[PDB]
Symmetry: D2
Subunit: 291 residues, 4 copies
């Protein structure tokens, strides 16, 4: 496995002109102390879409060099243009990332036949483990269990981050791909049911604010302490759903700032929460002892 | 709990003019021997919709009287007409059923406000535990976790059969309703993830053909043997999905007949499978050692 | 055609113990004066689901006998049980209905293969024109354009009431079935686009309150006065959507009573509107000069 | 209006290393001869996603300079990064484009509140008419009629290309935004119903192969000859749906090559059609006299 347990999809802290490197360094050290199992850098939660190429590269290399082999670092390097996914993947490989988080194409989309060629062209280009990221609610596109079955034979493709939110489809991947594909939950509110079907962890938004809970929930579940794990899941559910009340990472960045972490403003087209949803977030942060 | 583990949604075996009572008796004794935990009689799997009132009553009373207190018997008694759900519920109560399986209205539908009045009017009429049955893919209507939270305070309403297929919504019910509402999975391909979130069993189509597997999967999971339970789930997944290749109970009745159980023909508007889907079913029955 | 233009899906006015026959008579005469083209009696808008068999029969025969050949009368006679759809269809035929409104099965559902057998078994039983009613948001089930193509060859099956709300699917039916199947819009907010694709009218909820507008919108469109028709559609759109703010016929019965028509209470599981939605309805009724 | 009638979403013809400028010139002259009303350059149909920035700029400027004021030219300039949508929009403005086709954010997405800030930040930057492009099946994101109502007050925002495929939502935009927002259909199979609700044309994939049909269908409809327009729509429907059998522009580029137009290969992650779908396309091309 690239890692087991809690891999945080870390926000990118912005100053008003670029990236807050010192704040990022603080977050990285906090994650390592708090027992986060891995860092996913410049995923969707990290707003990679509104970062320039230079910012994405500086940011990914910074996380890699700061962590310095202490825990695994995974970079989001996929895009909806296959040539660009190739170039970025080779580049993060070349500077020592331990894994690649590679989203399906989105918006342009393609067929199941094109998904196979897409991911084979990216994988062929590198020698670094790859995690396929499926998130149909964002991309308009669903990579099926059959397409995944065909891809899991690839040498670098070892895992999927599964954010379809469709548990029947999760069971199908596991039954079909067996021990040739690790499953990571792509939704925090679904850690328990996914680890229960044989998943080995989560790439997590909620770990941004409670890394201990997300790590222990996985560790407990994987160790056979399924009830102790279930209770963390149920107790944090209302907070977790509050973090999805508006497009992520709007709520999780909002929350970090309410918890005095000073992580800056979102970049357009993301923006400040509306007032009613802000109040629902705060209520859940206070009930969970976070402010 | 009304029961824990595997509650079979038993087919109703039809002769060419009415109900095959002798065949039903054989099925009941087989279920008790095979360690099925409870019988759900005249649910959707039992084709209650195409049975006359007299047939529904004769059938339910027969299952109750044959079982004779050996295991719990639950009757489907709900409909999309509240007066009719009342009369049928009182009637199954009066002849000694142990639970009521009461579907949300369907087709006519109603609001969340009407769902509360619907279920309160049914419950008020009886003194028998009630299981609310939510199946939005069939009814057009989704009873939300908030509406369920309000209903679980009712004296008779103790459980939900949850066939939304939405695991996020299952977590929400459990986090919100806590120990005031038992959750039964309404989908066989989702037993593991639902028991994992605190569910206490399944009202099952797949138990019609492999009652031992469905019972042991639940017993194992609930007892902490989560891996042994997971393996039954994954091994039977392809068969289970084959049983949903056409509108249930078309495939499960088709399969029982292929396994030489002689359970008769479906009633219109259900009908014989098409040929390609029939072959996919057979392949999965043979691979699972069922024919 | 069974009729062209506006066929009202008439509410059934209830007294506190049964049916308000005098009120129904008043509504029928009002519809004929107001130039409504046809009456659909005991459809979903007429709450047939919560009427007893005797009430459904008394109600349908009353509308037929009161209208006395002045305009076409269509009865809803389908159900999700094929035997019961047969018996009811023959019965409305026998007392002189001019058309049958026959919904797809719902809740139990079936395959496309079963839909063909379902509708052939109903049609074979009668010699009265049949309108197939497709409403997947209520039934869970979508009859496809290909299945409709196969059925339109049937002698009695001449039309579809299309409430999928999917305009691409409406075009497909017309291109495929051609002049062998009349299309009626099953949504008032979609009269224009459906008549534009070759539809010949609407089976209407909004005609309950403004029969003149619904009739003229169709007459104008069919006569080539497409702009005059469009304006009625756009001006009444906000009222029309307000009539769907809660499960129909909750809002249209609520509105009739606000317009002093004294049509009684809904039957469970339908119930009174909630307050915020009630206010939105009233605002739209006042802006459209209805109260 | 920026234009009325048929605005072709022109493919970009690729050589094996870049763009086939001579082929594009031929296509442009053919469109002008064939009476196409406007050219949309580097939209989704033009595979802008897999073109470099230099290619996108060279391509857009080429179409603008070749057309040389003969008909309106609209460039796709939006992206899911607001800064990048700003820079590209200003740039196409600066070289004389007549309109901007600006998609909602996709994949990253945002709230309705962010959509307003997104589009205001793009518009504020320019003085060129803007067409908002809504395509939730591709972006994961639906701009609502209320958000559009608020934006149509903007000085540059004059239109929407509406590809939700939801005709109820089209009526809502028109009723709400009135004469402050032109509607273009974003689906060829929905030209009739959208022009019928007050739309003024289509930004079209099907115009790539039959520009005369798409132009005449609009001209006829807008001129009151609604039946003559309807017939073009119904006759071409099966071809049109065939063009959507796989992710556009896979089928339309495939078809152009079958019609001997020599427009080159698709760029990854788009790829060649599968065989069964290829045969369905060919059958429809032959039945429509195109090969
Ligand atoms: Cl997308
Ligand atoms: Cl799910
Ligand atoms: Cl239903
Ligand atoms: Cl639609
Ligand atoms: Na692999
Ligand atoms: Na209770
Ligand atoms: Na016919
Ligand atoms: Na404007």
């Amino acid at each position: 496995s690239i890692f087991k347990g809690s891999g945080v999809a870390i926000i990118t802290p912005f100053t008003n002109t670029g990236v807050d490197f010192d704040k990022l360094s603080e977050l990285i050290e906090w994650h390592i102390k708090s027992k986060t199992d891995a860092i996913i850098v410049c995923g969707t939660t990290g707003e990679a879409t509104t970062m320039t190429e230079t910012e994405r590269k500086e940011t990914i290399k910074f996380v890699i060099d700061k962590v310095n082999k202490r825990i695994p670092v995974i970079a989001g390097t996929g895009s909806n243009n296959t040539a660009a996914s190739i170039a970025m993947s080779k580049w993060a490989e070349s500077i020592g990332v331990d894994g690649l988080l590679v989203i399906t194409p989105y918006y342009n989309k393609t067929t199941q036949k094109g998904l196979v060629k897409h991911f084979k062209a990216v994988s062929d280009a590198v020698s670094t483990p790859i995690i396929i990221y499926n998130v149909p609610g964002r991309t308009g596109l669903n990579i099926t269990p059959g397409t995944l079955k065909e891809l899991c034979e690839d040498k670098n493709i070892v895992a999927v981050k599964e954010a379809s939110g469709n548990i029947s489809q999760i069971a199908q991947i596991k039954a079909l791909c067996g021990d040739k594909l690790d499953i990571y939950s792509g939704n925090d509110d679904q850690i328990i049911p996914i680890l229960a079907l044989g998943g080995i962890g989560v790439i997590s938004v909620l770990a941004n604010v409670i890394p201990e809970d997300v790590h222990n929930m996985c560790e407990l579940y994987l160790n056979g302490k399924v009830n102790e794990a279930l209770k963390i899941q149920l107790d944090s559910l209302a907070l977790t759903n509050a973090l999805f009340i508006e497009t992520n990472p709007i709520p999780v960045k909002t929350a970090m700032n309410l918890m005095n972490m000073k992580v800056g403003d979102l970049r357009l087209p993301l923006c400040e929460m509306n007032e009613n949803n802000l109040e629902i977030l705060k209520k859940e942060l206070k009930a969970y002892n976070l402010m």
